[PDB]
Amino acid sequence: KTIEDVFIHLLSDTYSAEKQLTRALAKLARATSNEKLSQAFHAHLEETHGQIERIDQVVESESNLKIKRMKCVAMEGLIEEANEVIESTEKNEVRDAALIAAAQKVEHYEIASYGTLATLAEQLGYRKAAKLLKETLEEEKATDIKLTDLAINN
Amino acid sequence: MKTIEDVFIHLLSDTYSAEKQLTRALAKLARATSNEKLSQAFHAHLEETHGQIERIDQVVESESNLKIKRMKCVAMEGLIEEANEVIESTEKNEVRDAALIAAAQKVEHYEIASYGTLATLAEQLGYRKAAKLLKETLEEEKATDIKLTDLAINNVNKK
């Protein structure tokens, strides 16, 4: 019933979301015909594991924190949009354009989640965590910009 | 995006959008099944959801600084597309209904967690009337979820 409870709840949700995204990204990388988009998805795959480890670092920076086991239902839905694109397109540029739009939805959600986690961390006085969450936030922004640019020369 | 207050307004505005989208989705869900009892539960929730949007207007009016910022909740949009994928598939009767109920329970998992978060934030920000209101929606969503589970059980035992 405290702000720290809300933060742990949200961090736990994002932890689930990231874990789910590792599976989705491995699959997206194999589903596209475009080598640059595929490489983009694979790079974000590796970075995502780096981001989960960062959440682990957030939890260790404040002895009271913990990751509660849960399933982030919102991410399931966003990952499904990409699945549906795959099932309704041939492996070509129509699929690529639609997968990038679906991936942007995923980025929208993740950027908003980390912005919220960062603000909470700072309002809680969690200095190291704030910094770590901002680091991931910046990586997601770069990732999103990259999808946009890929879309343009796509 | 710097105070608890900004986070609260952001999440409340997102939830406003979610409920808005949910209204359309529930009318479609009610028509997506031949199971009268399920159809009615979706119709009942459609009404309760319109009521919850009214409660959000009340939350906003309870504090001078509160407002609803315009935005599209991407999370709910995905959950609704998830349900629609079931609606638009060729799944039928018990298969179809198991998926519809399950999809609806996913929407509830999201709503419950959303209102739990908003109610705690409101409480922590000293918005007494808001917290009380948000806990009211929280409880309705929990009851709606329990009803969905009773229905899943019935569909599983359907003979």
From Swiss-Prot, chain B:
Transmembrane segments: none annotated. It holds the Pfam family DUF892. One of its GO terms (biological process) is DNA damage response. It comes from the Bacteria. One of its GO terms (molecular function) is protein homodimerization activity. Homodimer. This is Protein YciF. It comes from Escherichia coli (strain K12).
